[PDB]
Design a protein around this nucleic acid. Structure first.
Lengths: 82, 141, 83, 200, 129
RNA sequence: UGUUGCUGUUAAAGGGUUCGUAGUUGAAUUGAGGGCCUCUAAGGCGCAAUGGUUUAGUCCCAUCCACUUCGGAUUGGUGACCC
RNA sequence: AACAAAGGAGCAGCCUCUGGGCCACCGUUUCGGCUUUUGUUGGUUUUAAAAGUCCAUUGGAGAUUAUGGGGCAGUGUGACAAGCGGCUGUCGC
RNA sequence: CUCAGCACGUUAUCUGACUUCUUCACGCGAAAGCUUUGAGGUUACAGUCUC
């Protein structure tokens, strides 16, 4: 049977982070590789500004507000939230 | 509710539910501190220091990887601004409106907005002279 | 159960029925508060005779919450199977 | 004198316990000719005392007390210390608590305001937990409240970290109870953010 | 905003009870809200309740057995006394038999019945049937 | 005249709007502790033991083979679980 | 619940055994005040504790690592492109 | 390529706005009507302020 105290998985996929039981973060990090060398650099999913390394004028991320649009040809590894 | 005029928004930033530092951050307190102060010498406000840090270095929060947050750092090293962030910004916007209105006295909108921004600045002022962070003779103009 | 005296003696005309779903008193006035009696069954499909009973309130057919509650009542007593 | 009793507090050097001597030696052994960053760092580290607690469970628990001063250090190398000490001292868990102190309400407004909130009863207890759970981090707590007014703390932990601390749970719980006088339970959850308890 | 914590809680309970719902969510938590619930759970009007931790402010969750009929709040927290127990108990409640007014005292948080017993009045808090 | 205990969509009655001082009202945290003995005091989603041929069960197995909606078979089986 | 304060580097006492050295103490205006005992009152002066201050190490803590962080120097390790090399954009010295 | 790692549409989810059920649930109201968008949660009469 359903419970408010312990909610169902399918229900809490949907919900906003301000509407959630815990109200946790809705973001994560990523390792973006600089293809202009090999330099592994941490980058943030909702970067909301450019990030550069000295191994790239290829950049890493675009500033765009919806979530970062990472430069093509770049290695993406997905770090966990926790 | 929005302080002055209409508005209900829920656009906000949450927190992490893990207040201890990530396993992929092996950086010490001191490195974080140094980075903050370094950036600050360009004239950057704390708001953009945190952004630079989180995006480049993967920092979860300044507060999570050091025992203190961004202003406390700055204060202790004597780099802190004497005009709080929120106050300064409003005063900039204000003056810029007053430029536009100097030229255009037919502009209805920006006039009303300036009235808002004024009284808002005054509220801030009043606050920070109860909770000392400005001199007690401070005034907008 | 019910009002008593200081002498312990019942004073009530009747003690009204329970609606198991909401634990509210079924009134005489409500005529939409139906008593559903299901006959139990054992191995070899033999009826044990009518044994179990449900009672539904007349406030559960004004928006049809009836079905919902009957399931939670049933499923708990092992009458209705869930996987 | 001894050069292995320099890991005990100066007061306790002329009068060590049975308990305190075994570990003392073990530390000193570790300090020489071993994997790095705990051949040097223990020398700065001086323990207040330690004690040995015996439950009715299979293993016993040696609990350690060292000042809050050295917490910042020991927190880093916490893992490797615990493990390499349990090897030298088998059949008993090692845990590392850093000693703290607690305060009570003075029953006055203006006094209560000016006390530390890291000294306070609750924050202390919470960190005692986090220490004895390490390696593994707390996600979320619940208090459930029953018909007697009995309040019961639950804690919940990662399924990532599950394997390690799964065995250690009864031991941890025991120690926490007898000291801070509060019961604790430990569950797990697979997707901690959305907070659904599981046996995964 | 909300100027009484209690009012925010016990208008969720009352509404939910009138719809027959068997659990309710409560947006904030306070030390006070706990004690109120505790009372009613002893006397048999609530199954259980959980307090959940977000590490900002908690979210209480309660299991209703449907045995309540109202849970009110007396907002100004007016002063009631050893004689004036009588007054309140008549005026805001449908009965003297099963009406429960809950009060604050230096001693703690308790029913009027227990308040009289220990002979201390205080400021009122809330009430339930 | 409605503090206890009033009304204001249409019946007497929400100010054309916004800013704003006196005034009124204002979120959460500090935390109210424990053990050993007796008591059939209760619950148990803990549990060693040992009980129970269907004097109670379901999965496996046996025999059929029934194209597909029969079954029974005994010690079945530290299995499952029930007093 | 209210009053008031704080507003967070706009700060902040480590305790302690013993020994030595110096040192009036209030006070600073042309001479003022001053602790007992020595029988007592009147006068000066000394020794001595006290307090301060300087050094000394005796034992113990610390709520945040001083065998530490910060900055210089020597050697080897890994490494880019021109100068050099493989024998097929890229690899190494 | 060229205001273009683009723009639109469909499936599903969410936050913010305006309103419809001419099958809006409970409830309220003298009725007309009102319904997460209240005139609802009010004689079981008390969230806050003001006209």
């Amino acid at each position: 049977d359903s419970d408010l105290s312990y909610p169902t998985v399918r229900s809490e996929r949907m919900k906003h982070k301000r509407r959630r039981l815990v109200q946790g973060p809705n973001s994560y990090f990523m390792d973006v590789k600089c293809p202009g060398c090999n330099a592994i650099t941490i980058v943030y999913s909702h970067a909301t500004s450019e990030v550069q390394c000295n191994g790239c004028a290829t950049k890493l991320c675009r500033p765009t507000g919806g979530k970062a649009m990472l430069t093509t040809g770049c290695g993406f590894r997905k770090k966990a939230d926790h | 509710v929005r302080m002055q005029g209409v508005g209900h928004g829920k656009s906000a930033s949450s927190l992490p539910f893990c207040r201890t530092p990530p396993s992929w951050l092996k950086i010490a307190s001191r490195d974080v501190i140094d980075a903050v102060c370094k950036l600050a010498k360009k004239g950057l406000t704390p708001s953009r220091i945190g952004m630079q840090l989180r995006d480049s270095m993967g920092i979860a929060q300044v507060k999570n990887v050091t025992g203190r947050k961004i202003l406390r750092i700055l204060k202790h090293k004597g780099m802190a601004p004497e005009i709080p962030e929120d106050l300064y910004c409003l005063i900039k916007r204000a003056t810029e409106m007053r430029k536009h209105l100097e030229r255009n006295t037919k502009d209805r909108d920006t006039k009303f907005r300036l009235i808002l921004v004024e009284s808002r600045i005054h509220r801030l002022a009043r606050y920070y002279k109860r909770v000392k962070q400005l001199p007690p003779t401070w005034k907008y103009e | 159960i019910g009002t008593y005296n200081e002498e312990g003696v019942n004073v009530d005309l009747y003690i009204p029925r329970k609606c198991h779903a909401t634990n509210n008193l079924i009134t005489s006035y409500d005529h939409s508060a139906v008593q559903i009696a299901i006959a139990n069954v054992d191995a070899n499909g033999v009826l044990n005779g009518t044994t179990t009973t449900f009672c539904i309130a007349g406030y559960l057919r004004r928006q049809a919450e009836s079905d919902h509650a009957i399931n939670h009542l049933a499923i708990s007593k092992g009458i209705i199977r869930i996987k | 004198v001894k050069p292995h009793l320099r890991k005990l507090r100066k007061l306790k050097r002329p009068n060590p316990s049975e308990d305190e001597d075994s570990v003392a030696k073990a530390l000193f052994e570790l300090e020489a000719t071993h994997k790095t960053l705990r051949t040097q760092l223990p020398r700065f580290h001086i323990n207040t005392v330690r004690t040995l607690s015996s439950p009715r469970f299979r293993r016993t628990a040696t609990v350690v007390f060292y000042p809050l001063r050295f917490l910042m250090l020991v927190r880093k190398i916490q893992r490797t210390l615990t493990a390499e000490l349990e090897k030298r001292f088998p059949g008993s868990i090692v845990v590392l608590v850093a000693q703290r102190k607690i305060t009570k309400r003075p029953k006055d407004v203006y006094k209560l305001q000016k006390v530390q909130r890291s000294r306070t009863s609750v924050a202390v207890f919470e960190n005692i937990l986090n220490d004895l759970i390490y390696p593994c981090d707390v996600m979320g707590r619940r208090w459930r409240c029953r018909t007697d007014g009995t309040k019961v703390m639950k804690v919940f932990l990662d399924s990532r970290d599950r394997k390690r601390v799964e065995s250690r749970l009864p031991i941890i719980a025991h120690v926490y109870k007898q000291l801070t006088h509060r019961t604790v339970s430990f569950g797990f959850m697979w997707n901690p953010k959305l907070q659904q308890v599981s046996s995964r | 905003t909300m100027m009484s914590v209690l009012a925010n809680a016990l208008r969720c309970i009352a509404s939910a009870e009138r719809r027959g719902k068997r659990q309710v969510l409560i947006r904030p938590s306070s030390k006070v809200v706990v004690k109120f619930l505790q009372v009613m759970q002893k006397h048999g009007y609530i199954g259980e309740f959980e307090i959940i931790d977000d590490h900002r402010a908690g979210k209480i969750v309660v299991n209703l057995n449907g045995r309540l009929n109202k849970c009110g709040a007396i907002c100004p927290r007016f002063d009631c006394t050893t004689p004036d127990f009588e007054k309140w108990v008549k005026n805001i409640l449908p009965s003297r038999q099963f009406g429960f007014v809950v009060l604050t005292t230096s001693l703690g948080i308790m029913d009027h019945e227990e308040a009289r017993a220990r002979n201390t009045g205080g400021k009122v808090l809330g009430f339930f049937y």
